[PDB]
Amino acid sequence: EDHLAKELEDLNKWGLNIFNVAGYSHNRPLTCIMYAIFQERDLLKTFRISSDTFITYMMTLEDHYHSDVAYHNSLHAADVAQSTHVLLSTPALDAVFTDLEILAAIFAAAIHDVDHPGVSNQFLINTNSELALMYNDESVLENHHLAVGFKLLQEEHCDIFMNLTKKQRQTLRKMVIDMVLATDMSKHMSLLADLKTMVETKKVTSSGVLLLDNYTDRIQVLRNMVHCADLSNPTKSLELYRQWTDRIMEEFFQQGDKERERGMEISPMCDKHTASVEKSQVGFIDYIVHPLWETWADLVQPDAQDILDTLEDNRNWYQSMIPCQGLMEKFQFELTLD
Numbered sequence: 001e002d003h004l005a006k007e008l009e010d011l012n013k014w015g016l017n018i019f020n021v022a023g024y025s026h027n028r029p030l031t032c033i034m035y036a037i038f039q040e041r042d043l044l045k046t047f048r049i050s051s052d053t054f055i056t057y058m059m060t061l062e063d064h065y066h067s068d069v070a071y072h073n074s075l076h077a078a079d080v081a082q083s084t085h086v087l088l089s090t091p092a093l094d095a096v097f098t099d100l101e102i103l104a105a106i107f108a109a110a111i112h113d114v115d116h117p118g119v120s121n122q123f124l125i126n127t128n129s130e131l132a133l134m135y136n137d138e139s140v141l142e143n144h145h146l147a148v149g150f151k152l153l154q155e156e157h158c159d160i161f162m163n164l165t166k167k168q169r170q171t172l173r174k175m176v177i178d179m180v181l182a183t184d185m186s187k188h189m190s191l192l193a194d195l196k197t198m199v200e201t202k203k204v205t206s207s208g209v210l211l212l213d214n215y216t217d218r219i220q221v222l223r224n225m226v227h228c229a230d231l232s233n234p235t236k237s238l239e240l241y242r243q244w245t246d247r248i249m250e251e252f253f254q255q256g257d258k259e260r261e262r263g264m265e266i267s268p269m270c271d272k273h274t275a276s277v278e279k280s281q282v283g284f285i286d287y288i289v290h291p292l293w294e295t296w297a298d299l300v301q302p303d304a305q306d307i308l309d310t311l312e313d314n315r316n317w318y319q320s321m322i323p324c325q326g327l328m329e330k331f332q333f334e335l336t337l338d
């Protein structure tokens, strides 16, 4: 409507407010934002994707996110997709990616948490869930999000990639699988170590645009971009970030209650009777989010300085509400329990 079009004026900006978009699109923010993004980048035209087919696919995908899960619902997918859309346009990456690579990253972002049950991989492993048995304890959720997303493409009434070439579909699938598997937090430290090595050997044109030799380097940047998007809540305005924190803590605490009910050990940051919300965000920023974004900022300097400055301000706010490599691994364990 009127308010929706006003909010969508910020489609290409980090300050877009996805909560507002959700409110004005009958709780279909993913459908909404993906249609706005694809139209903005001319992807429907480029890849001969019919609008009806695209909407049907996106609505079905959206409906496969659980509305009763506090954080990992379709609003988080919409946020990651829109954040990825903004990251693909950072000046340091101008003309670096093919249309297929752009399509793959945004698609990956959209499907990356589909059918998430609101409990972690480790909870699924420890309770001997059907999903963990299916996936042999390895990136259980992420393998599942991919399987759902790709399973939905089988059916003409939903095959948005019908008009890509066979080679194109194969390359896209390879790329998307790579990106979604990279959202598994248990791989955070390795992704970061690999991204630091990339910053070290960074090469540019005389214009300040990154030079990426072949597929290996391109997919490495894209994996990290989606991971950054997934870890982007603390880099947004404080008003937005605080809502994301309320949501993750509601989801985590519900997992902790489930753990308590079943007599399992309570994961510390999922224990509502002990965990400090504020300290947890400070630690999340210090040992996970800032190290990653500091490295991303190095890769694309100076394009991400504003984000780094917002990150610092947000950290100081959470710290004010409280009355290195070793702790990097510690916080990765607290989240994953791996």
Ligand SMILES: CCCOc1cc([C@]2(C)CNC(=O)O2)ccc1OC
Pocket (backbone or CB within 6 Å): 185, 230, 231, 233, 234, 244, 245, 248, 269, 280, 281, 284, 335, 336
């Ligand atoms: C509570 C400390 C961790 O906080 C967050 C974690 C996460 C993710 C990346 C999602 N699940 C999780 O384990 O880490 C997202 C947002 C968070 O805060 C807004």
Ligand SMILES: [Mg+2]
Pocket (backbone or CB within 6 Å): 112, 113, 141, 183, 184
């Ligand atoms: Mg995930």
Ligand SMILES: [Zn+2]
Pocket (backbone or CB within 6 Å): 076, 080, 112, 113, 183, 230
């Ligand atoms: Zn996610």
